[PDB]
Amino acid sequence: ALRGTVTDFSGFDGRADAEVLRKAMKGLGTDEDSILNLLTARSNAQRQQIAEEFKTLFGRDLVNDMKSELKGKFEKLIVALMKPSRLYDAYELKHALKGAGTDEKVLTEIIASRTPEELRAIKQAYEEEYGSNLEDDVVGDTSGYYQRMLVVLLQANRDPDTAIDDAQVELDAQALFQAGELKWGTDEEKFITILGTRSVSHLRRVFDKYMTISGFQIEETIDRETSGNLENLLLAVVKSIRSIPAYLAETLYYAMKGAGTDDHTLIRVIVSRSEIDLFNIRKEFRKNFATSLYSMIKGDTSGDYKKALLLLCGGEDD
């Protein structure tokens, strides 16, 4: 079902590759093309093996060397590609929190689109790497029901997918109806519990039943009932329940649709999903936005940065 755009290389030789990277950086100047051509053709696991061989052969750190040779968005792109898979999400999260300011956009995006299984691994990796508890960190940098919704999600305790209970579907749809449209003000607590803990298959049925009952799609009520970060979060949650690929395909579009480009988001989504469901994200992009992701990046980016991006994403038609 799910498909990424990057797979393991067949005739992989970590040692051979490491020598190619060395030659590509040794001397005056850099062969950015040889770097990008090699790294976007190997799985993340293979990139770790290459960095390992590089160290044993030359006693130098591959990532630190590249950080010295490359610059701009390209460096940032390659540096993200080198980040171990099980650590990247935790890395993005730690950096959205840290500092004096917080990047709620990143928090919302990662916590809402990642499955409980992924949330549990991210929490582990986060703790072992930065010696801090993710929840404790988020709580400290957030507040209100936004913080609450995040904590609920961080529990990775979503109900399992079982046979759907129609009466329960009716009960939940009517409950949401009463907590929002029929209420003076909003009962955010009810939205948080239902959206945050019910199984995926169940909620999909609740979304349809709620539409039949209120004449509104749950998304419209959310926009009518809430505001700020909580609104964005809840929209993200509903979107992902419907389809993670589609929700991610949407945050990419808005990262480019604007005049400039949100390189941080573009890099993050493409890299983080390259070996998960990036192929699915591509289809959903064309289906919902008329253009392929390829052509969209092709015109919003440039340099080796643009080249690496298109090689990872690929597919001119979707």
What whole-number distance in Å separates Cα of residue 113 and Cα of residue 251? Answer: 11
Closest CA relative to residue 286, chosen from 255, 251, 250, 256: 250
Q: Does 263 bind Ca ion (CB under 5 A)?
A: no
* Shortest Cβ 148–Ca ion spacing (Å): 18
* Shortest Cβ 16–Ca ion spacing (Å): 20
User: Which x/- pattern, by CB under 5 A, does the window 180-209 give for Ca ion?
Assistant: ---x--------------------------
Q: Which residues, in sequence order, are CB contacts of 34 under 8 Å at separation 6+?
A: 20, 21, 23, 24
Would you say how long the chain is, in residues? Answer: 318
Between 95 and 183, name the residue whose CB sits nearer to Ca ion: 183
Q: Does 71 bind Ca ion (CB under 5 A)?
A: yes
* Shortest Cβ 37–Ca ion spacing (Å): 17
Between 159 and 223, name the residue whose CB sits nearer to Ca ion: 223
* Shortest Cβ 188–Ca ion spacing (Å): 10
User: Which x/- pattern, by CB under 5 A, does the window 237-256 give for Ca ion?
Assistant: --------------------
212-241: contacts with Ca ion (CB under 5 A): 223, 227
270-309: contacts with Ca ion (CB under 5 A): 300
3-state class (DSSP) for residue 227: coil
DSSP for 62-115 reads HHHHHHHH--HHHHHHHHHHHS-HHHHHHHHHHHHHSSSS--HHHHHHHHHHS-
* Shortest Cβ 242–Ca ion spacing (Å): 19
Between 13 and 223, name the residue whose CB sits nearer to Ca ion: 223
Between 263 and 300, name the residue whose CB sits nearer to Ca ion: 300
Closest CA relative to residue 253, chosen from 268, 240, 266, 244: 266
* Shortest Cβ 184–Ca ion spacing (Å): 6
**Angle CA(169)–CA(171)–CA(174) in degrees, nearest 5?**
105
Between 30 and 240, name the residue whose CB sits nearer to Ca ion: 30
Between 17 and 300, name the residue whose CB sits nearer to Ca ion: 300
**Site size toward Ca ion, by CB under 5 A:** 5
Buried b (16+ CB within 10 A) or exposed e, 201-233: ebbbbbbebbbeebebebeebbeebbeebbebb
* Shortest Cβ 106–Ca ion spacing (Å): 21
* Shortest Cβ 57–Ca ion spacing (Å): 17
Q: Which residues, in sequence order, are CB contacts of 56 under 8 Å at separation 6+?
A: none
Between 71 and 95, name the residue whose CB sits nearer to Ca ion: 71
The window from 38-46, 127-135, 175-183, 277-285 that contacts Ca ion (CB under 5 A) reads 175-183
**Angle CA(312)–CA(315)–CA(318) in degrees, nearest 5?**
120
Between 172 and 263, name the residue whose CB sits nearer to Ca ion: 263
What whole-number distance in Å separates Cα of residue 276 and Cα of residue 1? Answer: 10
Interacting residue ranges for Ca ion, rule: CB under 5 A: 71, 183, 223, 227, 300
